Amino acid sequence: NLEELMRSGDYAQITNMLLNNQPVALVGALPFITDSSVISLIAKLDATV
Amino acid sequence: MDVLYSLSKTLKDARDKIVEGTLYSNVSDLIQQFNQMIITMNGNEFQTGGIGNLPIRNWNFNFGLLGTTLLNLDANYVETARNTIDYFVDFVDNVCMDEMVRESQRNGIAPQSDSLRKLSAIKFKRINFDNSSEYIENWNLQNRRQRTGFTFHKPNIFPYSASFTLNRSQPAHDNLMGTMWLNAGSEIQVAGFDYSCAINAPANIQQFEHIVPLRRVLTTATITLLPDAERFSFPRVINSADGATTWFFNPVILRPNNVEVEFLLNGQIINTYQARFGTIVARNFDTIRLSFQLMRPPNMTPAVAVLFPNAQPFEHHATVGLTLRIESAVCESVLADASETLLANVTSVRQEYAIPVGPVFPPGMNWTDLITNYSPSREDNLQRVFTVASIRSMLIK
Amino acid sequence: MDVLYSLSKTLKDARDKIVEGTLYSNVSDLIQQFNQMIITMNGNEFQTGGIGNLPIRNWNFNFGLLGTTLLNLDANYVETARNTIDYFVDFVDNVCMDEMVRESQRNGIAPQSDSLRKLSAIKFKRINFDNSSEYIENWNLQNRRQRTGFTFHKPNIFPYSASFTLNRSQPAHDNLMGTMWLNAGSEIQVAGFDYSCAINAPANIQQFEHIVPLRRVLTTATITLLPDAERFSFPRVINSADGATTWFFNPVILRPNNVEVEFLLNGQIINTYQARFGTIVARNFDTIRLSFQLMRPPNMTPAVAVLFPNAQPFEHHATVGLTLRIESAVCESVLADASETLLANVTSVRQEYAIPVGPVFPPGMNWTDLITNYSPSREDNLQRVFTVASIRSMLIK
Amino acid sequence: MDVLYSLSKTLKDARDKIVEGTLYSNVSDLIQQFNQMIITMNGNEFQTGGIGNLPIRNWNFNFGLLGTTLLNLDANYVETARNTIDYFVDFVDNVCMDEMVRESQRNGIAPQSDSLRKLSAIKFKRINFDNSSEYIENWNLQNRRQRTGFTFHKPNIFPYSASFTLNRSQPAHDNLMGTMWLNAGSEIQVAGFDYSCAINAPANIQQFEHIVPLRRVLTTATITLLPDAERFSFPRVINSADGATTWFFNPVILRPNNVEVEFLLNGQIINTYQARFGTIVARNFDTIRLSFQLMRPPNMTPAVAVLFPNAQPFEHHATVGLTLRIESAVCESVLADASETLLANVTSVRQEYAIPVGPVFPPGMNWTDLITNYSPSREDNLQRVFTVASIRSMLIK
Amino acid sequence: MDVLYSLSKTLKDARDKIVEGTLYSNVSDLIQQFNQMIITMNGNEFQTGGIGNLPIRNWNFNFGLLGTTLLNLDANYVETARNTIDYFVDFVDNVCMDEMVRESQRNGIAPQSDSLRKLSAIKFKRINFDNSSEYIENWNLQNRRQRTGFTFHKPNIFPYSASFTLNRSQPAHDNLMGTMWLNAGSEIQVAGFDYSCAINAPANIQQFEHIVPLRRVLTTATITLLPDAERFSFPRVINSADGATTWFFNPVILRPNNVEVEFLLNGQIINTYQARFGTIVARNFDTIRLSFQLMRPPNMTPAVAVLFPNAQPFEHHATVGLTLRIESAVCESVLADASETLLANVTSVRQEYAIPVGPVFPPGMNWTDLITNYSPSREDNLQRVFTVASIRSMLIK
Ligand SMILES: [Zn+2]
């Protein structure tokens, strides 16, 4: 949960699961970005944010 | 191995300290340990079982941390932690049963199961917690070559043995001499007999002796010595040495004369006691040497003098015996005793899942066959399995 | 009940950790527990006693908090805390004696005294501390329906019984057959006899059997088996079945032939052992079935052959016996044993204050009468009283 | 004395909690204790040994503090602390052996060695840590005159004694009456006999009695009572009272009639039990009074009636016996028992270093001679030495 | 298990309360429950059946919510809800038949089918509704260890038994004495007979007795007692004990003299009734002890005196009997009775789908074989299956 993560302040797992490449699903209500480019898909953009 | 004890120590404390209504400062340092278990264990996957009828299970850890923000713990905080503890405590049962069931002959002190070999990486070393139990403290002192010690109450140091020895015999079996004994558990009952009652012995004294060697060296024992063997006191019929015929033994019992008990170590007399019954000590020994003798009484009332004639028909046979019993001692290798149930947990797992006979242990985990030939290859396996059985006893009785 | 253990745990630790000269960081978390006891307990008032000769006392709590500002504790800080601990430790004695003395028949697992019913409110739940003892851990696992277990050293599982059975008899009592036994504590000594020594039996073999049912199911026992009953080995005179006449029994003792010990569970054979003496295990059982037989020896020396004629006057009677002994086992209900003194604390309170016989327990707390009819209504009362007796043993020996 | 336990408690915890890879918050309060040991102990110098063959060693403390800045402990932090612990744990061994070996007669409860007198200053009182063991808790409660208690398993309360008493005798020794007994450890086996089998007694009943006084008052005992003395059941020959002649004893055994066991305290009957065998309790007593009687059976089959004639030749002598055994009890003074090895650690130090016989203890630390004359001057020495032996057992097994 | 009852409770109420034309405020709180069922159940998938001839079906839930906007419900709103209820009520039938058919021996109180193990997650706990039935209330009180109770009308507490006992017999079978009985269902008919009609008995009175032990403890029973056994009143021929020969029994019937009925609990007399027929109560018992005696009438008319001679040919045999019948009682374990059909629903599922004999229940679900050996392992299975059979009876009769 992104909200309970935000209220607690102590992360300690989102740091670990991201540094050591762990599979994860972040439940939230984010806004997104649309993208219409094959060059931006080959360039591996979605894993850099 | 050190991190398998550290998983069970903080799951035992998590069911005891995380209760409803308790103050947060009572559990403020356990939760920092329990959260740091979970961070190390996530993302990994394990596999236990496969031998005998022990089923194959797969383990996978994806859990969330505990909250660190309450003042008094409530029923939401307890019930969200019990459904995490109950998955770990099921994992530790199936790793401990996977290790008590396996054995090796080259180096038995190494881990044998697939899961315990994987827990011995430096990734999992941060789960390490205090090592305060008796078996995990002696696991660490002995791993650095320092002196260890286990304290026992009535240790099973003697294998079962019940036999005799005839120093004088004939096929009629009516004029005999020798000793009889029972060595079982932690108790020795020896009894010497003489049918003629020393009528032709020099100075009417017959000498007896019985020497019991041990398998391991005991230290600071408390021993009770009583001057009667109550088991070899009644009339019985006994077979011969090769099972051919039977012979009759009708005892009357005198008191043991000139008793000397010696406690040897590499042939050196450490302790000795001469006509001193009751409780005695024995600081360091590995061989017990009992010595006692029969003396014909020089003065006899008319009711006694009919029992012991000069001629051949002896209907009442003289008997002199002792009784020794070890109450508590300190050994350095693992053994079995009368207080703790570590031998019973090992055999009950092997009998339940129909485990085949391996290369090291006797068939059926027979303790009489295991202490008889107690090789250093069996000692390293027996310590490795009693220590895992001690870890499992904290969580699951 | 959970908060009665939590009062005694932090009064035991308060006499141990709050000593003179100690560093403040050693006791920095105990004082936060001990101050939070006092805040909950102030303003309340209690009343204990009233049954038998147990006197009525009134309790009232108005105390002040402890200081949290020193670096090393001094003699002012110790002596101002000892006169607060000594009032609480007198309160817990009179609540524990008020609960060990009362009993109910409908639901015995509920609290019965007036003070312990009042401590079971949600106001008093913040006094709750860790639950690490054996009896308070099994109080909580069994309250959620999870599997428990108590570890015993020589458990009193057998009621006292000493009797016999005659499978062949006549009013002269000179040609008999049957078994004799003693079941007492944790030890079985059975012995079978035959006066004719199987002179007319088919293949000169006489079969014996003795079946002992248990009251509760034992788990992972360590059992010692020895091939002689030393109690039924000497000549004695025994009364008849209805106390009319007496009969004489003069034994000689052969060895037991073809011994089979079986360990049953709902009529299913869990374990079996055939001519295997010494130490054995028994993983799960509730019925012990001993089987052994007498065989006439086919070859006899002239000293033996006079003992067993073909005609009627039999002056030397054949005897075959066994001996079984449970060293340690794990049960699920509470029992008595040889190591801990929880039964002795319960009876000593009832005998001292002249307590009348209630509806559940036998008169005088007779353990032979209580394990004979060990109903589920008596099991819930006996666990509730042994657990209170375990709490009182931490403070007052 | 209180600071000698406090040195050993935080050296035991330092080898258990300071391990490789552990989190720093697990050991954050131990290091504040261990650093504050070192600050107090630096600059001082000590001297142990000197009596017997115990060598003289000089001790000098100049060490540095431990680091308080890591997050997880590494192998540099462990290996720099092990070479500080190993010097302190060698110091505590030689202070504990210096104190178990010395004794005084005026005030034995005071420290006797040179090092333990120096540790009893107010400079060293800041090393004081929690006092949670059994012997150090009873050291402090008894030092303020509060009630203490030690829990034992089979306590050695009876000195060794094996003798008899003849209430009717003649120089032929063929018509006798009296009792025989064995008192050893925690077990009483008394047996009364009568050769005439009450043929001329009034109402054919012969009364027996055996009274055993204790040395210290026991509390809440669990006692097993069985109606046979198995040791006085076989034929034997016994010397006379002054060792002049020998006399013969050929028993047959009836059951004990009208058994009454009483538990006295200052001549007042606390408990009583009438024909009730099995397990019994005894809440407070210091004298056991056994009473039992022989009754001639009024109806006898022809096999029994030949044994007991009216005339003088009695070839089969009647015998009635009992058996008592204390399983566990609570005393207030220190004793020896079957579970713990505190007596064995004291004698093994004195035997190893060839220590001369002092003014208080018996030669060779004979427990039969020490419980026979158990003076209050020996009680204060025996508690002071068992408590030091309990401190040494934490570090060095 | 708790959520399986909660599915069936709000499908029963949905077919009853959602009718055509009803006001919306009558069903305003049911629709909030029924919509919140659907939200939890969507997206999941299940699988039932597989054992015996029970077919395998797959379940998948993708439904839409109900409308919450009408004032009176119309035929569109009913017919769009009936085609959702009819899919759920078919799902609950196949989960209840999947659970009544399976059994385990280790822990039978746990769910055994694949679907009911999946419903026991915390995701499905929000479907939980009120628990007001008798079996689901006793499922929850007994799961927390509180006292429960089931109310029965004529409970099947006695296994079927019809036999006799001869206290006096000879191979001619013409002078006999003893009792006959029938124990079946909830009724005891015992009858004692004597062929000589007490012509040589002391004071012409013959004593009879019949003791019936129960399997479980009954509470607050209503019992009818009538002074005649109508089943043992006519002439019949009966086989011998070993089936060798047959013997004849021609009764005449006197009235029972001196009737005493006792109601025991652990050997203690709870209730007693002396010559009191009709309806009686029994508050707490587990053993019924009937006692009655035959008395020869001292005065006889000439038509009676011919029936009972002094010599040997007895053509009219005396008979005295009783009759007991339990109308209603309260037990704590589950049983069978004469009012409800929970035993008939369990056996009809197993017989229909040809289910093999498992490890726990008798072959064919024989109630005489199941109440004879009514072990605690069978009690936990029998409660788990009667409770599932009670849930299925709400939806499908
Ligand atoms: Zn013991």
Reading phi first (left if > 0) and then psi (alpha if -120 to 50, else beta), residue B354 is in left
Question: Which residues lie closer than 8 Å to B219 by C-beta, 6 or more apart?
Answer: B149, B283, B284, B329, B330, B331, B332
Interface test with B, best of A1, A10, A14, A27 (most B CBs within 10 A): A10
**Residue list for the binding site of B:** 153, 266, 286
**Hey, what are C318's tokens?**
């054949």
For the four alpha carbons of D252, D254, D255 and D257, in that order, the dihedral sign comes to negative
Whether C145 and E143 lie within 8 Å, measured CB to CB: yes
Q: Which residue of B has its CA nearest to C153?
A: B339
Cα separation of the two ends of chain D? 20
Q: Which residues of C touch B235 (CB under 8 A)?
A: 251-253, 316
Q: How distant is the Cα of C394 from the closest Cα of chain B, in angstroms?
A: 18
Which pairs from B89-95 meet CB under 8 Å and 24+ separation? B89/B11, B89/B395, B89/B396, B91/B46, B91/B59, B92/B4, B92/B7, B92/B8, B92/B11, B92/B391, B92/B392, B92/B395, B93/B392, B93/B395, B93/B396, B94/B48, B94/B49, B94/B57, B94/B59, B95/B4, B95/B46, B95/B48
Number of Cβ within 10 Å of residue E141's Cβ equals 12
**Contact yes or no for B207/B300 (Cβ under 8 A):** no
- The angle, 0 to 180 degrees and rounded to 10, between the axes of the packed helices E376-395 and E134-141 is 140
**Hey, what are E375's tokens?**
């072990």
Neighbours of D, requiring at least 3 CB pairs below 8 Å, are B, C
Rg (CA), chain A: 14
**Contact yes or no for D337/B339 (Cβ under 8 A):** no
Q: Report residue D134: phi and psi, to 5°.
A: -75, -40
What does the alpha-carbon distance between residue B94 and residue B115 come to, in Å, rounded to a whole number?
A: 10
Distances (CA, A) of C202 to B10, C191, C199, C310, E245: 65, 21, 9, 15, 29
Alpha-carbon dihedral angle through residues C383, C385, C388, C393, given to the nearest 10 degrees: -100
Question: Which residues lie closer than 8 Å to D127 by C-beta, 6 or more apart?
Answer: C21, D3, D6, D7, D36, D37, D40, D41
Is there contact between A and D if contact means ≥3 C-beta pairs under 8 Å?
no
Closest Cβ opposite residue C231 in set D132, D228, D303: D228
Interface test with B, best of A1, A13, A16 (most B CBs within 10 A): A13
**Residue list for the binding site of D for Zn(2+):** 153
Interface test with B, best of C220, C268, C285, C339 (most B CBs within 10 A): C220
Residues forming beta bridges with residue C260, ordered by sequence position:
C274, C291
Is there contact between D and E if contact means ≥3 C-beta pairs under 8 Å?
no
Residues forming beta bridges with residue B188, ordered by sequence position:
B183, B324
Residue type, C264: L
Question: What is the interface size between B and C, counted as CB pairs within 8 Å?
Answer: 151
Q: Which residues of E touch C378 (CB under 8 A)?
A: 266
Supply the DSSP symbol for E124: G
Q: How distant is the Cα of B142 from the closest Cα of chain D, in angstroms?
A: 13
Q: Which residue of B has its CA nearest to D230?
A: B230
Give chain D's largest Cα–Cα span.
Answer: 98
Nearest to D46 by CA among D32, D57, D35, D37: D57
Question: Which residues lie closer than 8 Å to E121 by C-beta, 6 or more apart?
Answer: none
What does the alpha-carbon distance between residue B282 and residue B225 come to, in Å, rounded to a whole number?
A: 12
- The angle, 0 to 180 degrees and rounded to 10, between the axes of the packed helices E75-99 and E376-395 is 160
Q: Give the H/E segment covering residue C291.
A: strand C278-295
Nearest to D273 by CA among D227, D235, D338: D227
Residue type, D346: V
What does the alpha-carbon distance between residue D359 and residue E173 come to, in Å, rounded to a whole number?
A: 90
**Contact yes or no for C307/C316 (Cβ under 8 A):** yes
Give chain A's largest Cα–Cα span.
Answer: 39
- C-alpha D47 chain-centroid distance: 33
What does the alpha-carbon distance between residue B271 and residue D228 come to, in Å, rounded to a whole number?
A: 36
Look up tokens 């029936």; give the residue.
Answer: E307
Residue type, D228: D
Question: What is the interface size between A and B, counted as CB pairs within 8 Å?
Answer: 16
Question: Which residues lie closer than 8 Å to D96 by C-beta, 6 or more apart?
Answer: D4, D388, D389, D391, D392
- Does the annotation place E266 within a ligand binding site? yes
E76 SS3 class: helix
Nearest to E55 by CA among E19, E97, E25, E13: E97
Q: Hey, is the C-beta of C28 within 8 angstroms of any chain E C-beta?
A: no
What does the alpha-carbon distance between residue D8 and residue D85 come to, in Å, rounded to a whole number?
A: 11
Residue environment code for B350-377, b if the CB has 16+ CB neighbours within 10 A, otherwise e: bbeeebeeeebbeebbbbbbbbeebeeb
Whether D279 and C172 lie within 8 Å, measured CB to CB: no
CA B160 to centroid of ligand 1, rounded, Å: 20
**Hey, what are D6's tokens?**
């406090």
Give the helix ranges, DSSP H, for chain C. Answer: 2-17, 30-41, 75-99, 114-118, 134-141, 302-305, 342-352, 367-372, 376-395
**Contact yes or no for B296/B204 (Cβ under 8 A):** yes
E280 SS3 class: strand
Task: Count CA atoms closer than 13 A to D219's CA, side-chain side.
Answer: 15
**Hey, what are E102's tokens?**
């399976």
Distances (CA, A) of B1 to B8, B114, B132, B139, E91: 11, 12, 14, 9, 48
Number of Cβ within 10 Å of residue C42's Cβ equals 13
Q: How many helices (H) and strands (E) does chain D have?
A: 9, 15
Residue type, C343: L
Question: Which residues lie closer than 8 Å to E32 by C-beta, 6 or more apart?
Answer: none
Number of Cβ within 10 Å of residue D282's Cβ equals 24
What does the alpha-carbon distance between residue E91 and residue E85 come to, in Å, rounded to a whole number?
A: 10
D215 SS3 class: strand
Name the burial class of residue E43, with classes exposed (0-12), middle (13-18) and buried (19+) by CB atoms within 10 angstroms of its CB: exposed
Look up tokens 């009724």; give the residue.
Answer: E187
Pairing, β C317-321 against β C251-253: parallel
Q: How distant is the Cα of D64 from the closest Cα of chain B, in angstroms?
A: 24
DSSP letters along B295-362, please? E--S---HHHHTTS-SSS---SEEEEE-EEEEEEEEESS----SS--HHHHHHHHHHHTTPPP-SSSP
Whether C252 and B236 lie within 8 Å, measured CB to CB: yes
CA C339 to centroid of ligand 1, rounded, Å: 7
DSSP letters along C137-174, please? HHHHHGGGT----EEEES---EEEEEEEEEEE--TT--
Look up tokens 């010599």; give the residue.
Answer: E311
Reading phi first (left if > 0) and then psi (alpha if -120 to 50, else beta), residue E212 is in beta
Instruction: Give this entry's resolution in angstroms.
Output: 3.5
- The angle, 0 to 180 degrees and rounded to 10, between the axes of the packed helices E75-99 and E2-17 is 150
What does the alpha-carbon distance between residue E150 and residue E136 come to, in Å, rounded to a whole number?
A: 12
Question: What is the interface size between B and D, counted as CB pairs within 8 Å?
Answer: 144
**Contact yes or no for E182/E161 (Cβ under 8 A):** yes
Q: Hey, is the C-beta of C32 within 8 angstroms of any chain D C-beta?
A: no
Q: Hey, is the C-beta of A13 within 8 angstroms of any chain B C-beta?
A: yes
**Hey, what are B205's tokens?**
């004294």
CA B339 to centroid of ligand 1, rounded, Å: 7
**Hey, what are B338's tokens?**
């009368």
What does the alpha-carbon distance between residue B86 and residue B218 come to, in Å, rounded to a whole number?
A: 42
- Selected residues 104-133 of chain C with any CB under 8 Å from a CB in chain E: 105-107, 109
Whether D172 and B220 lie within 8 Å, measured CB to CB: no
What does the alpha-carbon distance between residue B38 and residue C30 come to, in Å, rounded to a whole number?
A: 28
**Contact yes or no for B89/B44 (Cβ under 8 A):** no
Residues forming beta bridges with residue D284, ordered by sequence position:
D219
What does the alpha-carbon distance between residue E272 and residue E376 come to, in Å, rounded to a whole number?
A: 30
Q: How distant is the Cα of D357 from the closest Cα of chain C, in angstroms?
A: 36
Interface test with B, best of C9, C127, C128 (most B CBs within 10 A): C128
Closest Cβ opposite residue C17 in set D130, D147, D277: D130
- Does the annotation place C173 within a ligand binding site? no
Number of Cβ within 10 Å of residue B200's Cβ equals 8
Closest Cβ opposite residue D283 in set C173, C174, C351: C351
